[PDB]
Point group: none
Chain length 183, copies 2
């Protein structure tokens, strides 16, 4: 691999199906995702980047899909080992029971979520859109209820939810490997 034509970026991803937004588990997962995907101080980043398995990581939950999905992913430089990054990515995600969330991690997560919420609520374009989604989704309250749930979420509940949801049986894998004179 002395010569490489300049090209695309290989991708690796793991996706997990979420419970309904109105269900009790959802907020915990959304926080767990938050803890997991933080750059640069997150668990995924440490597992993959300094380690040199990926250039960068991402993660988020996607409530507006039907049904809902949580996605975690990596972008890699060409020639980095795609299988290893995927296995590492999934292992970090599905091993929380061995390495449980700290309160410190959770409070930082909760604080960031609430900050974003307050930002939406304070923004006239945004709140209106958020309420429409809650209404279209069948419960107008749910924009408000999630905030309440985020404040009251116990670490044990977040941990239990992550462990139950971020599991192989709930896992869908995404991969992209970019195709490839006188040289």
């Amino acid at each position: 691999v002395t010569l490489r034509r300049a090209g695309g970026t290989p991708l690796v991803a793991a996706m997990y199906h979420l419970p309904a937004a109105g269900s009790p588990d959802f907020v915990g997962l959304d926080l767990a995702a938050t803890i997991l995907a933080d750059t640069p101080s997150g668990r995924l980043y440490h597992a993959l980047v300094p380690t040199k398995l990926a250039s960068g990581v991402f993660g988020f939950t996607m409530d507006q899909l039907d049904p809902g999905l949580a996605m975690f992913g990596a972008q890699l430089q060409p020639g980095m080992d795609q299988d290893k990054a995927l296995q590492t990515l999934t292992a970090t995600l599905e091993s929380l029971s061995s390495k449980p969330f700290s309160q410190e991690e959770l409070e930082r997560a909760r604080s960031k979520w609430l900050t974003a919420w307050q930002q939406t609520y304070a923004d006239p374009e945004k709140v209106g859109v958020a309420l429409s989604e809650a209404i279209a989704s069948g419960d107008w309250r749910l924009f408000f209820l999630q905030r309440d749930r985020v404040r009251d979420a116990k670490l044990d509940d977040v941990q239990r939810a992550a462990v139950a949801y971020l599991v192989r049986s709930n896992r869908t894998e995404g991969r992209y490997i970019p195709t490839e004179a006188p040289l």
Copy 2:
């Protein structure tokens, strides 16, 4: 403030449930409460008294109750508003992750505890009473065991325990509001 009949002022409180006295976490919370409610040095005071937010501050743990509770309170001045005081009190209790305890704080709190233990131990009426309670609780050793745990506690343990239990999920809120005497002419 402009006019009030003479009487008591409101007090605001926050209570958090505690682990079992037999748990090692318990001691960490006991010491954390002692750090937190230190007046006037202590954090609660600083947050509330000179902000003229509160007249006075208290905090302690109660292991005789089944189960245990930690209580923190603020005695308000007239016209101080309850909601603010309660909010700042709870917010300061529930934010230790943002501000860690210090070795200095732990050793001072540990010494107060040990002194209190010693006073009880020395005094024959009291020690018997303490041993009785330990026995009722189902472990005779507890009086002695708690002291050793206090001696053995590490700052991270205390810091970790405080942060785990001092949480809104665990919060109960109390307001003692004195009933206002009826207004009288000509005032």
